[PDB]
Design an enzyme around this catalytic site. Structure first.
Site, mmCIF file in Angstrom:
data_model
loop_
_atom_site.group_PDB
_atom_site.id
_atom_site.type_symbol
_atom_site.label_atom_id
_atom_site.label_comp_id
_atom_site.label_asym_id
_atom_site.label_seq_id
_atom_site.Cartn_x
_atom_site.Cartn_y
_atom_site.Cartn_z
ATOM 1 N N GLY A 1 73.527 11.288 -61.226
ATOM 2 C CA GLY A 1 73.796 11.861 -62.544
ATOM 3 C C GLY A 1 74.115 10.779 -63.567
ATOM 4 C CE1 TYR B 1 80.352 10.849 -66.359
ATOM 5 C CE2 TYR B 1 79.587 12.915 -65.404
ATOM 6 C CZ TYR B 1 79.939 12.162 -66.516
ATOM 7 O OH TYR B 1 79.882 12.716 -67.775
ATOM 8 C CG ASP C 1 80.014 17.373 -58.606
ATOM 9 O OD1 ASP C 1 80.404 16.547 -57.734
ATOM 10 O OD2 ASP C 1 78.794 17.668 -58.785
HETATM 11 C C1 LIG Z 1 80.286 12.416 -51.372
HETATM 12 C C2 LIG Z 1 80.909 13.342 -52.408
HETATM 13 C C3 LIG Z 1 81.968 12.852 -53.211
HETATM 14 C C4 LIG Z 1 82.545 13.716 -54.169
HETATM 15 C C5 LIG Z 1 82.092 15.048 -54.347
HETATM 16 C C6 LIG Z 1 82.707 15.776 -55.280
HETATM 17 O O1 LIG Z 1 82.479 16.983 -55.306
HETATM 18 N N1 LIG Z 1 83.546 15.204 -56.156
HETATM 19 C C7 LIG Z 1 84.420 15.860 -56.934
HETATM 20 C C8 LIG Z 1 84.852 15.456 -58.204
HETATM 21 C C9 LIG Z 1 85.766 16.393 -58.710
HETATM 22 O O2 LIG Z 1 85.947 17.330 -57.900
HETATM 23 N N2 LIG Z 1 85.059 16.995 -56.710
HETATM 24 C C10 LIG Z 1 81.034 15.516 -53.534
HETATM 25 C C11 LIG Z 1 80.433 14.676 -52.560
HETATM 26 N N3 LIG Z 1 79.390 15.191 -51.785
HETATM 27 C C12 LIG Z 1 78.142 15.577 -52.247
HETATM 28 O O3 LIG Z 1 77.920 15.261 -53.417
HETATM 29 C C13 LIG Z 1 77.233 16.273 -51.413
HETATM 30 C C14 LIG Z 1 77.468 16.628 -50.076
HETATM 31 N N4 LIG Z 1 76.466 17.241 -49.612
HETATM 32 N N5 LIG Z 1 75.419 17.331 -50.723
HETATM 33 C C15 LIG Z 1 74.171 17.910 -50.677
HETATM 34 C C16 LIG Z 1 73.113 17.395 -49.853
HETATM 35 C C17 LIG Z 1 71.846 18.032 -49.845
HETATM 36 C C18 LIG Z 1 71.587 19.178 -50.637
HETATM 37 C C19 LIG Z 1 72.616 19.695 -51.451
HETATM 38 C C20 LIG Z 1 73.887 19.079 -51.477
HETATM 39 C C21 LIG Z 1 75.961 16.719 -51.788
HETATM 40 N N6 LIG Z 1 75.446 16.532 -53.008
#
Ligand SMILES: Cc1ccc(C(=O)Nc2ccon2)cc1NC(=O)c1cnn(-c2ccccc2)c1N
EC number: 2.7.11.24
Length: 336
Positions: A30, A32, A165
């Site tokens: 994205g 970030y 997120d």
């Molecule tokens: C590593 C990580 C670090 C932080 C966050 C996050 O949500 N951060 C925050 C910030 C504020 O609140 N929460 C999420 C992740 N994980 C993913 O992004 C993630 C995990 N599985 N898939 C995925 C894989 C394939 C298809 C679809 C999803 C993703 N896109």
């Protein structure tokens, strides 16, 4: 540090992670932090590893890094993404310039499901129920997701969902947060759930706006132009001037819009897609709706422990945000 770190170039950037994390492969980004799918040698599980992008190169980024790590360390809920690990190749605070966050690797997001399928009613119930169960928990800690959409709603099919997120893209936004925040509450996320639910039931985007004015036009054709009662509560002159300039449109009956859908789904959609944020149903109330009678368990819909977010009001230096983030990395203990 304690583990042995290894370097590699992924995308157009240098990744330096411990030896337990193997076969790193990009997923997406994205503005970030891009994420790699990886294999945890210690657990035998596939993980998602996020490298924060220039975490301490600006005041906005430095506070955003802290915010994200505080959000992740606090939330412990089944429908909310959770932190497995947080690391840095740095051995001290002076060399600290990189942050890595580790979560579970999900199978797919809600955009993927709606493309390859036309969901059933039990499928929709379980997905929406899970999103609502997660929002009740999020909302109870006094956090609004604010950007809920199918790309941050992920499933480890099975069909078990996790919200991504949360506390810090146009089609799922509340109209009050579209035409300058004319006062807002947590139901800003409920409007998004409504938009997602309608798209899960029809297979099409509810309001696919080409710009911020076209988006408002689309919303208002379904929900109608603001009435007398609502117009009275708008303090912003420019927002009132804008509203008054549009041709009056009636609110449509959702029974003639969502043809063939479970009547209980339609009732619930009407409660979520209300123009007045003051009248819109909450996460806790939506979980009690009859549409979820198969899923609702008032003893299995927990709330969050108190979360101190006074830091949000504080204006600190990049190195103070860095030191504060450094403390959250050092103090971290896995779930396990
Ligand atoms: C590593 C990580 C670090 C932080 C966050 C996050 O949500 N951060 C925050 C910030 C504020 O609140 N929460 C999420 C992740 N994980 C993913 O992004 C993630 C995990 N599985 N898939 C995925 C894989 C394939 C298809 C679809 C999803 C993703 N896109």
């Amino acid at each position: 540090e304690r583990p042995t770190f290894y370097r590699q170039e992924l995308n157009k950037t240098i990744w330096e992670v411990p030896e337990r994390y193997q076969n790193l492969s990009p997923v997406g980004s994205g503005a970030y932090g891009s994420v790699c799918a990886a294999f945890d040698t210690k657990t035998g599980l596939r993980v998602a590893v996020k490298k924060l992008s220039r975490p301490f190169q600006s005041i906005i980024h430095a506070k955003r890094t802290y915010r994200e790590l505080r959000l992740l360390k606090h939330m412990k809920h089944e429908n909310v993404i959770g932190l497995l690990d947080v690391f840095t190749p740095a051995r001290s605070l002076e060399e600290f310039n990189d942050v890595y966050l580790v979560t579970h690797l999900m199978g797919a997001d809600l955009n993927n499901i709606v493309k390859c399928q036309k969901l059933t009613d039990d499928h929709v119930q379980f997905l929406i129920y899970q999103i609502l169960r997660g929002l009740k928990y999020i909302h109870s800690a006094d956090i609004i997701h604010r950007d809920l959409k199918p790309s941050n709603l992920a499933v480890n099919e099975d069909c078990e969902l996790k919200i991504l997120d949360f506390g810090l893209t146009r089609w799922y936004r509340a109209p009050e947060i579209m035409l300058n925040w004319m006062h807002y509450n947590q139901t800003v996320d409920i409007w998004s759930v409504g938009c997602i639910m309608a798209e899960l039931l029809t297979g099409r985007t509810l309001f696919p706006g080409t710009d911020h004015i076209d988006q408002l036009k689309l919303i208002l054709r379904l929900v109608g132009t603001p009435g007398a009662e609502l117009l009275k509560k708008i303090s912003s002159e420019s927002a009132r001037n804008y509203i008054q300039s549009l041709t009056q449109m009636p609110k449509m009956n959702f029974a003639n819009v969502f043809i063939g859908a479970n009547p209980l789904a339609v009732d619930l959609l009407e409660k979520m897609l209300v123009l007045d944020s003051d009248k819109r149903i909450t996460a806790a109330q939506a979980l009690a709706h009859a549409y979820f009678a198969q899923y609702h368990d008032p003893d299995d819909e927990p709330v969050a422990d108190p979360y101190d977010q006074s830091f949000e009001s504080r204006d600190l230096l990049i190195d103070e945000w860095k030191s504060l983030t450094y403390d959250e990395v050092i103090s971290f203990v896995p779930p396990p």
